[PDB]
Amino acid sequence: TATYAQALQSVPETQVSQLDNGLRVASEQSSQPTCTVGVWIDAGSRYESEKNNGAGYFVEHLAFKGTKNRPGNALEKEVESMGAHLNAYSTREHTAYYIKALSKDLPKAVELLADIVQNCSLEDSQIEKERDVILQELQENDTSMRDVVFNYLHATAFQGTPLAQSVEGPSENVRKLSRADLTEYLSRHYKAPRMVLAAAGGLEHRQLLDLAQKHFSGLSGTYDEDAVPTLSPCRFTGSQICHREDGLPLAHVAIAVEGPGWAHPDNVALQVANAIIGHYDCTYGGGAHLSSPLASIAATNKLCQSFQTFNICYADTGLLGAHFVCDHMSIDDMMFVLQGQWMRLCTSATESEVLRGKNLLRNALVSHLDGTTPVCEDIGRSLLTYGRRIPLAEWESRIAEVDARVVREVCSKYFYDQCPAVAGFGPIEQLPDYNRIRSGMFWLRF
Amino acid sequence: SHTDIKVPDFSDYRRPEVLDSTKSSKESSEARKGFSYLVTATTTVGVAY
Amino acid sequence: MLSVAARSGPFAPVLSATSRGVAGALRPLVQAAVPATSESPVLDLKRSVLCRESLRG
Amino acid sequence: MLTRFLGPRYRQLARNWVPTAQLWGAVGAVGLVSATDSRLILDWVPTIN
Amino acid sequence: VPPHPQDLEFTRLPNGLVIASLENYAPASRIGLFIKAGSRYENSNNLGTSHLLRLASSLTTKGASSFKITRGIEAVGGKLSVTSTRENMAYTVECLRDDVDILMEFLLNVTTAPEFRRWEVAALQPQLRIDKAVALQNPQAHVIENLHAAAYRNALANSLYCPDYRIGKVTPVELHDYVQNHFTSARMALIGLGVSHPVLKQVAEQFLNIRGGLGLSGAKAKYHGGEIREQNGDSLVHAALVAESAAIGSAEANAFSVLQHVLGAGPHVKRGSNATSSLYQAVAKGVHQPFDVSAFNASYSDSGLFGFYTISQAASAGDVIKAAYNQVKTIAQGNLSNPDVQAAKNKLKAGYLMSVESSEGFLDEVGSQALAAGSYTPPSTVLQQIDAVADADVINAAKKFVSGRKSMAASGNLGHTPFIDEL
């Protein structure tokens, strides 16, 4: 029987190959009869102006509504008739369109993906139906306290930078965005060196290549030159936005310090530290006995309904911290305990818990790369942010190296005596004053 | 619609070291905490006297 | 092609120690999110969706 | 009687608080010295007599 | 260059326990103990016992205290989760290869040596209410629970959630009785992923040799029919119309699965018109906007519920339902293509293969197979099984839906939601 360590070496190397465009085409062959193909693009909303904002989210809507070779609804009819699934997403920094389909179907899936990512038919009649659809989605998202808090958080931490914006854009932009606005944004961003065709499953890398030359030859070649800007850094500010509303029954709060971007090696230690603090929710079995002190004290004294630590990453910055949900009279204790753990970890982190963290992280990593879809997604994203595919063996080595000293050194650097970005919504009368939250980011013992 | 949620400009209040959206703030942090803390340290030395 | 729940349709709850309580088989909803006004709480006396024990670095 | 506090972790705890505890005692030391002057404990260095 | 695979090894022990394992050279492992113990084995005197049980996977066991279970598993970063359906209860445990042994031990302790101490069970009762409240915030969970209550007079009618009047009353003796009589060898299956057959086989012969409980798959689900209606004011009416279909494993079940795909299950395209969905286009044609439809298909050991589910504004419920029902009728009257069944076959097969893409998916599929059939049926033959479904088999299932005594559950402002009488 092979060991865990040995198994990490067994995962087939992700093969990377570049087209004469800038289009990277990468794959991880498995033995599965199913697969997942997709196009990851370096286009988000961190790339948008202000008047523009909402641009990509608007294209996502039109993306599967018709191409020039496949009109109004023909695309759907093809994807559906082969039993495939076509999905898509958009963050502040990434856009993706992926097809989840049978392995034989790889040729058509790539062909379809090309047609959508290049020959899109943003027909006036359709862009007009989508404005009504998007506005409703904005109305819907408003009822999600959690989505709101994270947008508030982004909006305050990144105050006057492009990162402060949301993906969907302001309602006024949704109703005024024109076809020209969308066409220009597509032209500026949907270009080869900023896209990666990724796949995973029962495919041979040569198929992917052939398909990529066959259906993607026709981008960046006779293109590029002037009008291709980079990304400017985004100042983190550290402040607070409170949206008092006693009508809602549970407070939502999200607090975070500025984290480093994707590239930085110290994300591993941050994740170990975050894993130790972990997450909680009112349906976890095991209450009082949970390892994480926050979790434990939260469940026993019922100081919350749920909480989760996060380490969000963007180009050269990020939001590192936690989010929680609770009754109006528990916001203070909840915070006190939350912050209690950061400092404890900043100052007195101990060896056993660090191993728990490392182990929680080894399981999260491996458990997440299970299935053509997450793996495919992983290939595409990685190449956009890392320029490589980081093999599990490397992440293992990076996790292995973390000990207590690292944890208390890396947490200190990002947490100890730094200003947080705080965002609150709901019954927040007892959300602590900023200064007090600020004063809980350091400790007088130490 | 909660997407219409602004964040009023504070340029009119921000220290100079933090006025540019174009750059980090991690740099001026040390100087900023430095200053504000030096002030309180000097004070305690004062009161101590 | 057994596995009643995945044969899609009948319900299947899950409890956990570290993960979260799930309730999740088949019926519509997904194409009511499209023709819309399919609200939802967010986080009214609840828990949390998507769940955790997934990550990276 | 009172020794559940023995073990790798407790030992680890102690070592993480050593630079701190030592530093803290020095505070109080210099503090006591300066408070009652260099006769009532600790004379020496650039200060008069 | 991926490594050449491995085949799943299967073994029925003479006491009826089944053991199945795949050695995928994965960094993690997965072990699940599948037990025929779902809510359908509860009766009038102990409803809810399987819920509380499902919530008690980490109470103290001989050999392992709660604290240990919780702290021991989290120390290697593994999981212990239990999931139930009306027929089975499945305890799965997951962790890296190097740690199977301890997880294996906790698994055995939870499923075969629970102590269910009076005080620990007392402290757990309120969880039934928190757990139940969280599941019930999806209008679907009410409806489907009411659907089964309405359709069956017996076993499958039981709810997967503890009835309110029992919260606080299920007793430690009722859990012990539920375990001694349902968690036995002849009703169990030990599936492994990332372990080896000898090890599972060893564990099974040493620890899973328990027997003295009940016997087969039931008291027998007697389908009866009828309808449950829950007035609500949710702005959206949820309704599900259903008839008796066919038991899982039978050829006829496959016909129903194919019918489900001719009519329409979930969506394939984000924010799509759902062109190949017979029900959807049929409702859409005469109903203008917020709405959803999907065929519904549930199949169990000795019965099956097939039909459709609808979500729509309160005043359009009648229209949505009537259009949906008429669409099925159209199929039952012969108006079915060949490329439609072909497309459905492709939607179903692609979906099945997709459903076992990952460990979690594969494992549950292997466990349920072990319980339902006592065999493991490879993807090749399942695809072959689906192909044998003829157009007439599909037509015949629709015809069976159209004329069978119906069952229905609906919640919302029911003022325009028809009664069956009126369908």
SS3 A56: helix
Q: Do C5 and E248 touch (CB under 8 A)?
A: no
**Residue in the structure block whose two tokens are 């949301």:** A166
Report if residue A3 sits inside a domain: no
Q: Do C57 and A361 touch (CB under 8 A)?
A: yes
The strand pairing partners of E21, in sequence order, are E9, E192
Residue A109: CB partners within 8 Å, gap ≥ 6?
A35, A37, A84, A99, A101
Which chain C residues are within 8 Å of E291, Cβ to Cβ? 32, 35
Round to whole Å and give the CA distance between A157 and A154: 5
**Residue in the structure block whose two tokens are 């600790």:** D42
Determine whether A353 is an active site residue. no
Q: How far is A233 from chain B (nearest CA, A)?
A: 6
- Asked if residue A295 and residue A216 are part of one domain, the reply reads no
Round to whole Å and give the CA distance between C49 and C23: 11
Q: Considering only CA atoms, which of E256, E411, E258 is closest in space to residue A83?
A: E258
- Asked if residue A59 and residue A117 are part of one domain, the reply reads yes
Q: How many domains does chain A have?
A: 2
The strand pairing partners of A15, in sequence order, are A27
Q: Does A350 touch chain B (CB under 8 A)?
A: no
- Asked if residue A257 and residue A129 are part of one domain, the reply reads no
Q: Do B23 and A170 touch (CB under 8 A)?
A: no
Q: Considering only CA atoms, which of A300, A287, A255 is closest in space to residue A418?
A: A255
- Asked if residue A218 and residue A253 are part of one domain, the reply reads no
Q: Considering only CA atoms, which of A251, A230, A435, A238 is closest in space to residue A330?
A: A251
- In the sheet with A24-29, reading across from the earlier edge strand, the strands are A15-18, A24-29, A195-201, A34-41, A95-102, A85-90
Tell me the two tokens of residue A2: 């092979």
Nearest-5° Cα angle at E398, E392 to E400 = 100
Q: What are the start-end ranges of the H helices in E136-196?
A: 139-151, 172-182
Domains and CATH numbers, chain B: 1-49 (1.20.5.270)
Would you say A2 and A174 are in contact if contact means Cβ atoms under 8 Å apart? no
Q: Side-chain half-sphere of E287: how many Cα atoms within 13 Å?
A: 27
The strand pairing partners of E64, in sequence order, are E61
Q: Which CATH class is domain D1-49?
A: mainly alpha
Q: What are the start-end ranges of the H helices in A306-391?
A: 331-348, 351-368, 372-385
Q: Considering only CA atoms, which of A325, A318, C38 is closest in space to residue E271?
A: C38
CA torsion sign for A189, A127, A151, E292 is negative
Q: Considering only CA atoms, which of A439, D15, A73, A367 is closest in space to residue E359?
A: A367
Tell me the two tokens of residue E188: 């169990």
CATH number of the domain residue A292 falls in: 3.30.830.10
Q: Considering only CA atoms, which of E86, E367, E55 is closest in space to residue C10?
A: E86
Q: Do A141 and B2 touch (CB under 8 A)?
A: yes
Report if residue A65 sits inside a domain: yes
The last residue of a domain, from among A183, A202, A227: A227
Domains and CATH numbers, chain E: 1-211 (3.30.830.10), 223-423 (3.30.830.10)
Which chain A residues are within 8 Å of D12, Cβ to Cβ? 350-351, 404
Residue A217 Cα distances to A22, A191, A212, E117, E329, angstroms: 10, 12, 7, 69, 49
Report if residue A367 sits inside a domain: yes
CB atoms within 10 A of CB E219: 13
User: Superfamily for C1-57?
Assistant: Cytochrome Bc1 Complex; Chain I (2.10.210.10)
Which chain C residues are within 8 Å of E272, Cβ to Cβ? 31, 34
Would you say A110 and A118 are in contact if contact means Cβ atoms under 8 Å apart? no
Tell me the two tokens of residue A113: 């993906």
SS3 A358: helix
- Is residue B49 exposed (0-12), middle (13-18) or buried (19+ Cβ within 10 Å)? exposed
- Asked if residue A218 and residue A108 are part of one domain, the reply reads yes
Report if residue A232 sits inside a domain: no
Q: Do D9 and A351 touch (CB under 8 A)?
A: yes
Would you say A392 and E27 are in contact if contact means Cβ atoms under 8 Å apart? yes
Would you say E102 and E55 are in contact if contact means Cβ atoms under 8 Å apart? no
Q: What are the start-end ranges of the H helices in A70-123?
A: 74-81, 106-118
**Sequence spans of domains, chain D:** 1-49
Would you say E367 and E191 are in contact if contact means Cβ atoms under 8 Å apart? yes
The last residue of a domain, from among A172, A195, A227: A227
Q: For residue A364, give the nearest of C40, C46, C54 by CB distance.
A: C54
Interchain contact E/B (3 or more Cβ pairs less than 8 Å): no
Would you say E302 and E246 are in contact if contact means Cβ atoms under 8 Å apart? no
User: What approach was used to elucidate this structure?
Assistant: X-ray
C partners (3+ CB pairs within 8 A) are A, E
Domain of residue A96, residue span: 14-227
